[PDB]
Structures are given as C-alpha cells and as structure tokens.
Design a protein around this ligand. Structure first.
Ligand SMILES: *C/C=C1/C(=C/c2[nH]c(/C=C3[NH+]=C(/C=C4\NC(=O)C(C=C)=C4C)C(C)=C\3CCC(=O)O)c(CCC(=O)O)c2C)NC(=O)[C@H]1C
Length: 311
C-alpha cells in the first residue's frame, strides 16, 4: 500500500528519485513505445480524440489528419464489431482483437476504459497443448518452476527467462532460470523491494503482462496528452504499448538488457511473483505469442496455488 501517486510530469508532478519510487504514476505516462501506434476514441461517437505522434508510420496518415475522424470512417469493418464487442461497463482488461490488412499486416487491440476506447496497432506476422500439459503435470513446485522457465524460453527465444518469487517483505529471489550460456546468472540472487515498487506490484495484479521492447527507444507522446472528455490523463495501465517508467528503463540498460517482458503470477489475489524475460538486444514479441504467454501465466498461477495448498 504505497504513498499516493504524484501527478504526472506534464501536470507538474515531481520527477522520481530513489526516495519516492512508489509514487510514480506509471499507468498515465501520456506516451507509448515506438514499435506500435495508439489512438483513443470516444466510446459512443467513435471520434478519434488522441493520436500517438508516430501514427503515420503505421497508419499512413498524419496525427492531425486522424484526429477528429471517426472510427466509422477510419475502420469501416471493425467499428461495428468493435461497437458490438465493447459497450460500457465491461472489465477494462477485456480485449477486442483483429488483424488489419494494410498495404503488410497490423494487429489491432482495443480495450475500453470508462467512456474511452484505447486502440493499439502493431505489426503482426499445437505447442500450447504441450506447454499446458507440462505445467499441469509438474508434481512439485521446483519442477513446476523449471518447466515454466524452460517452456517460456522455448516459446519466445528470450536470452534469459527467470521466475522471481516475492517474500512477505516484498524482496524477491530468482528461484528458477533458463538462459543462454553465458547470460549473467541471477539464479539464487536476491533483490530489494524497491526494484519492483508497490504501485507497480499493484498494477501487475490488474494487468498481467507488460514489456519494454527496446530499452533505449524514446517514448512517443500522445497528442493531445490529456483526454478531451475529462481534461485528465488517459489511463494506459491496460495498454501493452504504454511507455515504461524511465527509472526501470535505466535499470534494464544498466543490466545490459535491450528488451524486457514479464508476466504476473497471481495467487489468492496477491502478486506471488513474476516470469521475468530478458533479451540482450531489442526484441519485439508478436501479439499472438503475448496472448499465449498470458495463458501460460494463468495456468502457472493456478498450479502454484494448487501445489502450495497441498503443502
Ligand atoms: C525508484 C525506482 C526504481 C525502480 C522502479 C520500477 N521498477 C519497475 C518494473 C519492474 N522491475 C522489475 C525488477 C527486476 N527485473 C530483473 O531482472 C530483476 C532482478 C535481476 C529485478 C529485481 C521487473 C521485473 C519489472 C516489471 C517490468 C518488466 O517486466 O520489464 C517499475 C514499473 C515499470 C513499468 O511498468 O512501467 C518501476 C517504476 N526500479 C529500481 O531498482 C528503482 C531505481
């Protein structure tokens, strides 16, 4: 239970230091990672309200031209199924996904937060069964953690995949590791609570996967930065393209990590730990594979719950 959020920087909030890690409002950076584009739209009218400044890279129209258009005009085919898929009241973790054939393929991911639709666009291009069975069949916690890390590494090609388990003081230990020789080994290494601060842990119980595809890439602003509906920040906790905390970006660069991704392990509604993945170079995992990893995280969570109850 951290101290309350600071305002974000663009609303005059303080820049974060090691004295106040937990107060960074990481869910409302007003910016995205440059491997995709993000638009926000009115949930009733479909008016495009905010556009990431790099949108032309992915959509072929400048932000100023996109802004003010409706999703009916921009996405004729998707808008009705979108209108049908995401009416008011739904969980903000609920997703609509589609593939757009853009002259070559864009993955569209849409979620609703209150009266706003958040649209994420990024390039896209029988083994899940075997992964699920492997996790189900592990007869003890050690075996389960080994299978989880090995399976995730196999599926993703990440240089290093670890299982990070939280202690009651919110310090953590890496208790399983699958890696390329000789990525630095963190197996058995322990880390302070502040490295994964309490507002991050809280967010990670609500939105179960997040990533930084390129730890040296500059964030791309949303324009306008505030949602015109509310004159308030746009909630991006459920957007995988959300810019990552600069403090964490620096942590990763200092570790020689070019790309990072984690998946929550949730037991009894608490953050038990994280599947922590690193690559030394930048690395973008395809959207469909992210969905697979989320499924694997849920399965892992349920198996950890099961095996701990048996003890
Ligand atoms: C004062 C602020 C600091 C800071 C804040 C911070 N950290 C995160 C997110 C993560 N931290 C993680 C920690 C580890 N990754 C590893 O490989 C190890 C051990 C070797 C540790 C301990 C992880 C896994 C994450 C999740 C994100 C990811 O998977 O890449 C945040 C939130 C980031 C975000 O979602 O935007 C914040 C604010 N970290 C510090 O050490 C201090 C300086």
């Amino acid at each position: 239970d951290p101290l309350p959020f600071f305002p974000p920087l663009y609303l005059g909030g303080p820049e974060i230091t090691t004295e106040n890690c937990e107060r960074e409002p990481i869910h409302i950076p007003g910016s995205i990672q440059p491997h995709g584009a993000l638009l926000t739209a009115d949930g009733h009218s479909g008016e495009v309200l905010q556009v990431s400044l790099n949108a032309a890279t992915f959509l072929g129209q400048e932000p100023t031209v996109l802004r003010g258009q409706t999703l009916a005009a921009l996405l004729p085919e998707q808008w009705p199924a979108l209108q049908a898929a995401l009416p008011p009241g739904c969980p903000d973790a609920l997703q609509y996904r589609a593939t757009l054939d853009w002259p070559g393929h864009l993955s569209l991911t849409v979620h609703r937060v209150a009266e706003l639709l958040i649209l994420e666009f990024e390039p896209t291009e029988h083994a899940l069964r075997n992964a699920m069975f492997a996790l189900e069949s592990a007869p003890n916690l050690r075996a389960l953690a080994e299978v989880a890390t090995q399976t995730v590494r196999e599926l993703t090609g990440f240089d290093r995949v670890m299982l990070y388990k939280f202690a009651p003081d919110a310090t953590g230990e890496m208790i399983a590791e699958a890696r390329r020789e000789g990525m630095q080994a963190f197996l058995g290494h322990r880390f302070p609570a502040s490295h994964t601060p309490a507002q991050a842990r809280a967010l990670y119980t609500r939105h179960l996967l997040r990533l930084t595809a390129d730890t040296r890439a500059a964030a791309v602003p949303l324009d306008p930065v505030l949602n015109p509906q509310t004159n308030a920040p746009t909630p991006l906790g459920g957007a995988v393209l959300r810019a990552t905390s600069p403090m964490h970006m620096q942590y990763l660069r200092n570790m020689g990590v070019g790309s990072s991704l984690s998946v929550s392990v949730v037991v009894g509604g608490q953050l038990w730990g994280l599947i922590v993945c690193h690559h030394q170079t930048p690395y973008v995992l395809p959207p469909d594979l992210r969905t697979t990893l989320e499924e694997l995280g849920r399965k892992l969570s349920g198996q950890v719950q099961r095996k701990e109850a048996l003890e």
